[PDB]
Every structure is written in structure tokens, then in C-alpha cells.
Design a binder for this molecule. Structure first.
Ligand code: SF4
Ligand SMILES: [Zn+2]
Ligand SMILES: [Zn+2]
Ligand SMILES: [Zn+2]
Lengths: 96, 42, 103, 131, 752
């Protein structure tokens, strides 16, 4: 979950598996993603009004961006730890 | 590098270096000459 | 280490499996931590305990844990008085003295 | 191109002195240096190939809008509304007649913009501004 | 049980009642009798929603007027919760009376939440779900399929099956939540959305969001069909002003203007093609507009206009189209030159803060566009798109944006402001201009509601101060009160931590967010609270950027390494799907006892609607005061409008908004008086804001906890958890915190 930056060497044998790990993350999101109850359906909560077009909230309400406007990767570690906890909880849901 | 911005262009070069740049005293403890060690740092 | 309520309850269920039907099946858990790390689902273990008629009483040490409270309630048929949390050393001794009477 | 003057062939990058000068009779992306080089001595024809309209130096101006068709539409709208300025007070509250007048104004503006009936609309504009 | 208030029999679906619930019902009933607006702050935890539902249903069924009920909450999950409580209440009423009386109670939400079509289900945008549903259900597709049976256009079977049966036979009598309604419509192959729309008027009670009654883009259909002499309840109305402002606010970007130019060009090509093929379809529009028929007359009832009406219906004009935009090509030229004027206006290198009157004057002198043709822009674009009958409108979405902007800035001139910012964000290298048409008066969107409805019950768990709202929104209140919850033992522990363990001061102001001492103190606080909190712990941050930065540097410094040893870390993702899965995982971890922490924003999606009761709560840890970014232009404009309109000060309103967000974060921990949980507020500046808290939170907050440190706050938390991990005394809570029927009768006899 540490923020990855480009000046580190990494390892040439292991760093080719980064794309495969992102592919596995998408695959994990595939069977993690399921419809939830309306008690905790925040997507339904924000899509209750589909045509709302108010003021776009200030930059403290969006993920942080670089000088070029691209994502800084801070949301990526949040996604990673959320996916880690979901994997830990989903591993409890089995035949054991 | 300092005239491109006068002409309006963006200078890709920084201004060069031409413009603006810069005992042993006596030892009373003679019985351990070589047992004590020097410590110039913490 | 890290506590495992599910592993403890699974071995308790295994130990109480050869117990005859006339003999009551009880598990007294002195739980010190506030969280448990389980290898699998613990609600399945609680359901198996209820099906095997095993009554669980937990003497907690720090605070009220909801998984222990729900386990005690399910194993004691809606009775929430079987989850005990100590106050002092005298109250902990009183809890251990209360734990010797038949349920 | 929207960035460089095709007549003098100068990019905005190396030459920031170019400007968005156009003419109402023919809208051309032409720079102030080209205007002062050609039309200062006298009136001449349009230096862009395929056009030969006569035009003057003092009629040049900077373009407000990005679209050439929008710029010429608002310029034609100004050239119509300078003499056509009847309002609801001039029509004495007759809302349907004011709407019909607005229909006629937009019709003649569209006709001047597309050149479909330019001679008859110009004649009508002249005989209505003579009053 | 069943009791009596004056002459009104009330059927409470619980054998026991709270004194706060009974006094709440008394105040609501006397408000309904007098016929005015009320403001009520029930303590959280107590059954506020069930008290509202019980008293209002009893009033509606017993009184001969039989007034309908409009239950307006802020969040679709809260509409679901109110619907579930309504089913419980009406099942109890059916069991008590022996029969199911004639009752209709329905919740209303969007097509994205009430769509069962297998094709248009996985579309992530409610706009495109809406557009595909009209594309299949305007009736134009039905007539096209009737004329040509071999036409490739299709119809929705759920919408089609509603034509076979009547409106009163859509659902059986009773209360339908969203889940039960979806199950019934899936097993009967019916459209739940159109079912709810068609029997809005048949409901004894209809529950929906604040958007469907404040936002006129969707409320103009609902307000007409609901009763205008009905009782209106505004549940969780502490953040109603954000909805009111967002109803009439708009932002425009240069990307939006580029797509607007492309949509205008595609539109001009579309009128060119239609004029080439057949011009009668525009000639009849011209004849109808000359006659004076509006969008209501031309549009049929079963289809919708393309651009939703962005402004209030009484602010809409009733006269005919002025004729500048009556022709198709004339309106396309008008729209194109308006969009080009907007493009010229956004090329300004500094901040412009201008009135709509000044904007209209500048637009008139530079473009010759008047206010009256702009006031009909959305209606004219909707009519033009309707009779162009275009299949694709993805190019015309920006045209909807432009028409909405034009109508808003044309018909509104007072209480609104246009802000042109050369930099949308200051972090970006290349400038990105933005144009924001912002509503500075939150009372504008809610004024027709109070003009229409006689009895409005503004209600929240944590609405404070109560006198702020009759000033901030221009309405008169017949009674405003906050209840103090009566407890045998102090169920919640509010604590204000103004310093760390080593007495270094802690604060969450945005410019020192990278302070290592403050970040280390917050990390150590969170570590100790995670170690001593049993089941779950929710930590609310002032902003998402603050939370991202502090969590990233917490992971850098290794605080999360021993947070993970005790609790699973779940962070509120900006994606709502991932946030909902994170919330479900958090609740699962709290239930099975693994232990969980949820890091969320105090003004985010989680802070509204979502509750944390029993194991899901137990600790609300507030990193700092959730202050809004004060240097933002729109907030400064709103604050200035408050200053020279309702004499509300800069710091007073900023503290009010931030403290009400803190209060709504603190109020989520309690449901029931058996529930418990600590509320810690980690900032220096909460210590002066004890009076700005809600009354029950201030009663729970002692004077010795205003300037706590981390270690003694931890010790107090341990003592509190050990104290209420013990079984409470039924003799102590027999008749002081919860009432039986005989206790209520004795209290009534003592009152009289
Ligand atoms: S009619 Fe109902 S089910 Fe069919 S597409 Fe529209 S919202 Fe979905
Ligand atoms: Zn020198
Ligand atoms: Zn040139
Ligand atoms: Zn020319």
C-alpha cells in the first residue's frame, strides 16, 4: 500500500507482473461487485436525482491531482486496502 | 537564457555560470597510546 | 498471538460431540481481546453450536463484543445475560464463582 | 489555420505580434502586420487565393467570436438592427404583431447571412432605412 | 400499544414508548391542529421516524379531512428506512384492528433505482438509463411499431403490461418498499417506476427525496399530482439548503461549450436534412407556436420534454414565444451565438463576479440577445428536439446544459451570481476556465413549498441552532424546540480532544495538513482508539483531499501497520459502487467481530443517510471540524449574501455549517437507548463550540471534557465501555427513560 514512484529500481523479473496484478485486481472486482441492499445503496442514493446539475464541488472534494491534472495515486492505495479487506472478509464466506 | 523571456519566448535553459555565481597536543595518558580511539563524529 | 474464536468454538464442538445427550454441553470462554481473527465464517460455527445444543457463556475482560453477545444469545435461546464483562477483580472473582452453578 | 496567419505565414509561437484581424466584407484570418503592409498604401483585393473582393484598411477589426459564421451573423444582425429597432412600445402593446416583426427581422437576417435573396433584401433594407 | 392524545387514538407499533416520543407526538399533533410550520430536534437514537409515521397515519385515518402525507427525506436509503418502518407500523395496525384498511404508501425514486429492464440495467448513468427508457416509452416508438410491425424499434414489456390493468390495480393495498416493490414487479413483469408515477395521487403517504420537491427539473411533475393541502414532513432537514442551492445552481466548462458547439452544428445539420425531406413536421410547430401553444400543450402527458424545466413554474412565463427563436434555423443561430458569447466570456484571465442583470446587459450589447427569448430557450429546444425526433441526443446533452443555463440566468436576477474563474483548480498547469451560475438565496427554491403547503414539519436529529433556519429560509415557525433525551445512564460520551498525548496541539486546518506532529498525534489517537474499541469505529475527516493526504502519509509512517493488527481499514471511495461494497464489508466485519474502521468524509456520501448502530458505531472519531474551504468564490458569495440579507456573520455561518455537519456525523452512532458509543472531536476549536452543538449532545458533553488530551480521553473511553458493557438495571430504567402503557397513562393524568 505504499505509494509507488518511478525513481525506485524495483526488480526486472518481478515488475513484469504488475500488469498481471492489475488484471487480477479487475478480476477480483468482478466477483466482489454485487448489488447491495437499499439500506446501504449509495449509488442509488446519488442516482436518485439523475438530472441534478448543481455546482461542482471544490478541489478538496475530489481525489488529488498532479500538476498535469492526472491522478496522483493516493486513491489507488485506498482502493487497494479496501480490496484487501473485502478479500479478507470474502475468504471467510466459504464451505469451511 | 535571460533574453528569451525579454523577447517573449520561454527559455529552456537556465542562466549559465557567467552571470551570477559564487592541532596535536601532548598526551598525559601514555599507558594507552593506541587503546583510545579518535571520535570526530557522534 | 491473535485470538481465534472460531477455532476455539470448533474444537469445543469437537470435544462436546462425544458427550451423551443427558449430559449438558457448556463452553465458558474467558475472552480478553476485543477482536477475533477467524479462518472462516463464525456465524456458521454459531449455527452449528445451536444445532448441537451447546450453551456458551463468555466472561469478557475489556468491553462488550457483539459477536460474543450474539453467540451467547443464540446459544442460550435469546438470553443476553450470559455475556458478562468484569468491572474489578472482586467482580471477576464473583463471575468465576457464578460460573460453577448449573445452568 | 486558427493559430497562424496564412498570408504572412507566421506562427503565434515564434511571432506573438500577430492579431485576429478580420474584415466585415470578407472574414479572413489576417494579421495586423499584413494589414499594414498591404492596405496602408491604398485599398486592394483579398490576398487569400480564390477571393478578389475589394476592401479598405479602416474597415478592419478584431473578431470577437471563434466561429466565422457566428461573427458574420452578429455583424449582419447589427447592420439590420441599427435601422430596425421597433419595440413593443412602437407596436403599442400588440404582442402578436411584435412577434411577426421579429419573424421578419430574423427572416431578413437569415437571408442576408445565406445570400439567397441578397439583392431584393438589400433593396428592401435601403428603402426602409430611407424613411 | 394504543393510546390517546386529546381525541386522537395513536397506535404505536411497540409495547413501550419513550417520553421524548410522546412529547414529540404531542407537539406534532398541536402543530397539525394550529396549522403552521414547526421545527423539531428529536435526539438521535430515539424513534423519531416511527413516531412521525405512527402519529401522522393515526391523524390521517382518524380525522375526517384525511390529509395526505408527503415524507421528504434527504437520502434514498432513508426513504427505504421510512418505508420499512411504515410497513412495520401498518402491519401492527392491521394486527390490532383485525383488518387491513384502505391504505396506500409508496416511495419514489429514479429509473436507475426502479428499472427492471434486463438490457438497460448495467448502464452506470441515470441520465442514459432515463434516455433509453424514454427512447423505448415516448409512445412515438409504440406508434411507429403500430404503423410498421417490422420496425426495428422495440418496446419495454414492463411498461407495456401496465396498459392492460388499471391504475388502482397496479399494486395491492398496503405499503411497498423499494425491495418488495421490485420483487413484486419482477414476478408480475411490471415497471415499478411508472407504477409509482401513475399512483402518486392515490397514495395516502408518498415518501421521496428532497430533490423531487425542491429541484424543479423533476418536482414540477410531482407537485402537480400530490395534494396541495397535505401534511408535509421534512425529515433530516439540517442540510436542506444544499439541496435548495443545488436545485438552481449550474457549472459550465470549456469542454461543455465545445460539445455545445458540436451539438449545435449537428442540430443545424438535422434541421437541414428534415427541411430537405419533409417540412410539414416543422410547419405545424410554427403554426402551433404562432397560435400560442406551449410545451404542455404540444407535448403529450405520457412523453417528456427533452430539456427539463430548470426554474420555478410560477417564474416560468405564460406568454407565447417571442418569435426570435420560433423558426428552427433562427433558434439554432440564436443558440450558436449564445454559445459563442459564452466562449468569449470564459476567455478572461481573472475572476469575474457579476450579476445576471449585468450579464444580460453585456450579452445584449455584444450579441443582440434579449432576456425574453432566453427565458423560452429550454422549452424551444425541447420542442425542436421532439419534432426532430432524433434517436441520439448524446451530442445534445451539452445543448440541454446551455438551455438550462440560459433559462436560469434569464429568469433569475436577484439572489443569484455568475462566477467566471480562469482556474477551475489551482493545481493544474494549463488553465481550465469554469463558469458557475450559483444560487445565493437558499429560500428561493423552498418558498413555493411553504406557499403551497399549510403544515410543514421541519425535523432533524441534529438541527441546531433552531432559530437559524427561519432566518436563513424565509418562513415562519409556529413552534421550534429541541428535546433532551431522558436516560437512566448516560448512553453516549461526547469528548473534545484539543491536544495529543504529549500536549502538542491538534488541528485540521487545510494549510498545516502536512504537519508531522499533528499527523502523528492523529495517528496515535486512531491507533489507541482502534485498540480499545471492540467492534467498529468510524472516523470522519473534514475533506476527501485531507483524508487522502493524511492516510497516505500514515501509510508512509507506518501507523496503518498496527491499525491493521486490530481492525480492517475501509476508506470511502469516490466511486459509489466501491463505497457501498466497503460499507457492506465494514458492517460484515463489525458483525463477525473481526473489528473494523471506516475512514469517511464528514461531508461525503457516507455521512448522509448511512447509520452506524450498535456494533457498526461505538465510536465516531472526528478529525477536526469539517470546515468548508473558505477561500472558494461560491462560498464567499453565499456568505456575503447572508451578511447583507439575513444579518448572518461570516464566522457564525461557517461555524454553523461545519458544526451541523459534525452533529450529523455524531448522530449516526445511536439507534435506541440501549445503543451506546463515544463521540470524540479531535480539534482545538470544538472547545468553544459546545453551545453550537445540539441540545442533547451538549447535555451529554460535560465541562471536564472540553479540553481533553488523548491519553485521558482513552482512559475515559475505556471506563465508559467497561461501565456500559454491564447490564443496566430494569428497575432503574422502568419508568424514567422508557414508558409502558400504564406509565404513559400515569404521566397523562399527572399532566392533566
Ligand atoms: S419502463 Fe420501467 S422497466 Fe422499462 S426501461 Fe423504463 S424504467 Fe426500465
Ligand atoms: Zn561580481
Ligand atoms: Zn500576416
Ligand atoms: Zn476576401
Amino acid at each position: 500500500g505504499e505509494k509507488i514512484m518511478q525513481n525506485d529500481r524495483g526488480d526486472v523479473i518481478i515488475d513484469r507482473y504488475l500488469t498481471l496484478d492489475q488484471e487480477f485486481d479487475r478480476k477480483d472486482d468482478d466477483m466482489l461487485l454485487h448489488p447491495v441492499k437499499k439500506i446501504i445503496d449509495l449509488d442509488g442514493n446519488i442516482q436518485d436525482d439523475p438530472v441534478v446539475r448543481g455546482n461542482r464541488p471544490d478541489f478538496t472534494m475530489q481525489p488529488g491531482v498532479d500538476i498535469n491534472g492526472n491522478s496522483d495515486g493516493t486513491v489507488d492505495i485506498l482502493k487497494g486496502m479496501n480490496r484487501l479487506s473485502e478479500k479478507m472478509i470474502m475468504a471467510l464466506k466459504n464451505e469451511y | 537564457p535571460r533574453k528569451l523571456q525579454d523577447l517573449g519566448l520561454k527559455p529552456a535553459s537556465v542562466d549559465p555560470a557567467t552571470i551570477k555565481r559564487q592541532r596535536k597536543g601532548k598526551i598525559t595518558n601514555t599507558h594507552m597510546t593506541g587503546i583510545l580511539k579518535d571520535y570526530s563524529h557522534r | 498471538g491473535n485470538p481465534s474464536l472460531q477455532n476455539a468454538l470448533e474444537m469445543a464442538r469437537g470435544l462436546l460431540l462425544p458427550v451423551p445427550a443427558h449430559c449438558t454441553r457448556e463452553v465458558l470462554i474467558v475472552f480478553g481481546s476485543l477482536s477475533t481473527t477467524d479462518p472462516g465464517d463464525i456465524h456458521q460455527t454459531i449455527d452449528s453450536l445451536v444445532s448441537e445444543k451447546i450453551r456458551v457463556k463468555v466472561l469478557g475482560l475489556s468491553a462488550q463484543v457483539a459477536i460474543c453477545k450474539e453467540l451467547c444469545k443464540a446459544t442460550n435461546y435469546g438470553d443476553e445475560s450470559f455475556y458478562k464483562i468484569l468491572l474489578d477483580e472482586t467482580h471477576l472473582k464473583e463471575l468465576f464463582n457464578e460460573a460453577v452453578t448449573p445452568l | 489555420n486558427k493559430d497562424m496567419c496564412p498570408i504572412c505565414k507566421t506562427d503565434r509561437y515564434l511571432s506573438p505580434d500577430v492579431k485576429f484581424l478580420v474584415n466585415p466584407e470578407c472574414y479572413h484570418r489576417i494579421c495586423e502586420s499584413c494589414v499594414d503592409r498591404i492596405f496602408s498604401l491604398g485599398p486592394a483585393q483579398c490576398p487569400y487565393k480564390g477571393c478578389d473582393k475589394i476592401l479598405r484598411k479602416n474597415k478592419f477589426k478584431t473578431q470577437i467570436f471563434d466561429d466565422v459564421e457566428v461573427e458574420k451573423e452578429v455583424d449582419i444582425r447589427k447592420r439590420v438592427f441599427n435601422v430596425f429597432n421597433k419595440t413593443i412600445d412602437d407596436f403599442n402593446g400588440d404582442l402578436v404583431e411584435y412577434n411577426k416583426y421579429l419573424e421578419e427581422v430574423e427572416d431578413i437576417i437569415y437571408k442576408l447571412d445565406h445570400g439567397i435573396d441578397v439583392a431584393k433584401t438589400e433593396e428592401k433594407l435601403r428603402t426602409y432605412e430611407e424613411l | 400499544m394504543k393510546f390517546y392524545i386529546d381525541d386522537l387514538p395513536v397506535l404505536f407499533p411497540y409495547p413501550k414508548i419513550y417520553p421524548e416520543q410522546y412529547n414529540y407526538m404531542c407537539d406534532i399533533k398541536k402543530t397539525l391542529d394550529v396549522g403552521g410550520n414547526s421545527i423539531l430536534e428529536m435526539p438521535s437514537g430515539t424513534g423519531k421516524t416511527v413516531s412521525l409515521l405512527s402519529l401522522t397515519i393515526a391523524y390521517q385515518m382518524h380525522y375526517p379531512e384525511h390529509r395526505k402525507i408527503i415524507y421528504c427525506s434527504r437520502t434514498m436509503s432513508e426513504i427505504e428506512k421510512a418505508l420499512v418502518e411504515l410497513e412495520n407500523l401498518m402491519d401492527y395496525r392491521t394486527k390490532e384492528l383485525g383488518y387491513q384498511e384502505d391504505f396506500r404508501g409508496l416511495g419514489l425514486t429514479s429509473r436507475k433505482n426502479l428499472c427492471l429492464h434486463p438490457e438497460v440495467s448495467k448502464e452506470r448513468k441515470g441520465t442514459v438509463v432515463d434516455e433509453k427508457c424514454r427512447r423505448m416509452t415516448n409512445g412515438q416508438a409504440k406508434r411507429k411499431l403500430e404503423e410498421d410491425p417490422e420496425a426495428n424499434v422495440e418496446l419495454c414489456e414492463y411498461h407495456e403490461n401496465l396498459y392492460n390493468i388499471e391504475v388502482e390495480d397496479y399494486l395491492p393495498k398496503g405499503v411497498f418498499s423499494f425491495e418488495k416493490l421490485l420483487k413484486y414487479c419482477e414476478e408480475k413483469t411490471l415497471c415499478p417506476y411508472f407504477i409509482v408515477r401513475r399512483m402518486i395521487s392515490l397514495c395516502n403517504i408518498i415518501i421521496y427525496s428532497y430533490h423531487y420537491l425542491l429541484d424543479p427539473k423533476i418536482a414540477e411533475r410531482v407537485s402537480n399530482e400530490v395534494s396541495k393541502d397535505s401534511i408535509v414532513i421534512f425529515d433530516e432537514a439540517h442540510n436542506i439548503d444544499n439541496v435548495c442551492i443545488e436545485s438552481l445552481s449550474l457549472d459550465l466548462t470549456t469542454d461543455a461549450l465545445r460539445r455545445a458547439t458540436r451539438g449545435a452544428n449537428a442540430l443545424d445539420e438535422r434541421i437541414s436534412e428534415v427541411r430537405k425531406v419533409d417540412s410539414q413536421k416543422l410547419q405545424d410547430e410554427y403554426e402551433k407556436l404562432v397560435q400560442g401553444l406551449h410545451s404542455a400543450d404540444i407535448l403529450t402527458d405520457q412523453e417528456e420534454p427533452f430539456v427539463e424545466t430548470p426554474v420555478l413554474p410560477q417564474d416560468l412565463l405564460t406568454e407565447a414565444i417571442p418569435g426570435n427563436i420560433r423558426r428552427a434555423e433562427h433558434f439554432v443561430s440564436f443558440l450558436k451565438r449564445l454559445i459563442e458569447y459564452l466562449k468569449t466570456r470564459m476567455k478572461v484571465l481573472h475572476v469575474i463576479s457579476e450579476t445576471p442583470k449585468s450579464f444580460l446587459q453585456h450579452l445584449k450589447q455584444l450579441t443582440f440577445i434579449e432576456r425574453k427569448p432566453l427565458r423560452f430557450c429550454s422549452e424551444r429546444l425541447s420542442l425542436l428536439v421532439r419534432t426532430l425526433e432524433v434517436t441520439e441526443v448524446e451530442d445534445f446533452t451539452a445543448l440541454k446544459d446551455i438551455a438550462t443555463f440560459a433559462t436560469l440566468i434569464s429568469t433569475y436576477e436577484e439572489g443569484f451570481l455568475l462566477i467566471i474563474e480562469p482556474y477551475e483548480i489551482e493545481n493544474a498547469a494549463v488553465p481550465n476556465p469554469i463558469m458557475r451560475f450559483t444560487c445565493l438565496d437558499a429560500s428561493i427554491a423552498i418558498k413555493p413549498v411553504f406557499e403551497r403547503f399549510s403544515s410543514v414539519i421541519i425535523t432533524s436529529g441534529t438541527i441546531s441552532p433552531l432559530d437559524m433556519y427561519p432566518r436563513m429560509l424565509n418562513f415562519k415557525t409556529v413552534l421550534q424546540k429541541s428535546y433532551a433525551m431522558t436516560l437512566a445512564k448516560k448512553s453516549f460520551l461526547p469528548m473534545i480532544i484539543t491536544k495529543g498525548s504529549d500536549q502538542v496541539a491538534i488541528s485540521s486546518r487545510f494549510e498545516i495538513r502536512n504537519d508531522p506532529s499533528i499527523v502523528r498525534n492523529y495517528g496515535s489517537m486512531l491507533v489507541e482508539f482502534a485498540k480499545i474499541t471492540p467492534d467498529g469505529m468510524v472516523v470522519f475527516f473534514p475533506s476527501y483531499l485531507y483524508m487522502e493526504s493524511i492516510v497516505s502519509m500514515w501509510q508512509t509512517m507506518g501507523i496503518l501497520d498496527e491499525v491493521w493488527k486490530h481492525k480492517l481499514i475501509l476508506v470511502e471511495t469516490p466511486d459509489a459502487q466501491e463505497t457501498s461494497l466497503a460499507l457492506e464489508t465494514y458492517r460484515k466485519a463489525c458483525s463477525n467481530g473481526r473489528g473494523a474502521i471506516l475512514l469517511s468524509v464528514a461531508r461525503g456520501k457516507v455521512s448522509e443517510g448511512i447509520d452506524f448502530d450498535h456494533q457498526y458505531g461505538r465510536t465516531v472519531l472526528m478529525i477536526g471540524i469539517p470546515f468548508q474551504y473558505t477561500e472558494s468564490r461560491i462560498l464567499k458569495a453565499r456568505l456575503e449574501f447572508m451578511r447583507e440579507n439575513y444579518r448572518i456573520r461570516e464566522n457564525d455561518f461557517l461555524s454553523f455549517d461545519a458544526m451541523r455537519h459534525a452533529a450529523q456525523c455524531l448522530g449516526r452512532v445511536l439507534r435506541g437507548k440501549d445503543d451506546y458509543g463515544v463521540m470524540v472531536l479531535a480539534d482545538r476549536r470544538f472547545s468553544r463550540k459546545r453551545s453550537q452543538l445540539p441540545k442533547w449532545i451538549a447535555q451529554g458533553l460535560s465541562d471536564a471534557d472540553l479540553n481533553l488530551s488523548t491519553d485521558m480521553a482513552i482512559s475515559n473511553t475505556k471506563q465508559f465501555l467497561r461501565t456500559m458493557a454491564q447490564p443496566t438495571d430494569p428497575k432503574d430504567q422502568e419508568g424514567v427513560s422508557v414508558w409502558s402503557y400504564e406509565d404513559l397513562i400515569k404521566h397523562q393524568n399527572s399532566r392533566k
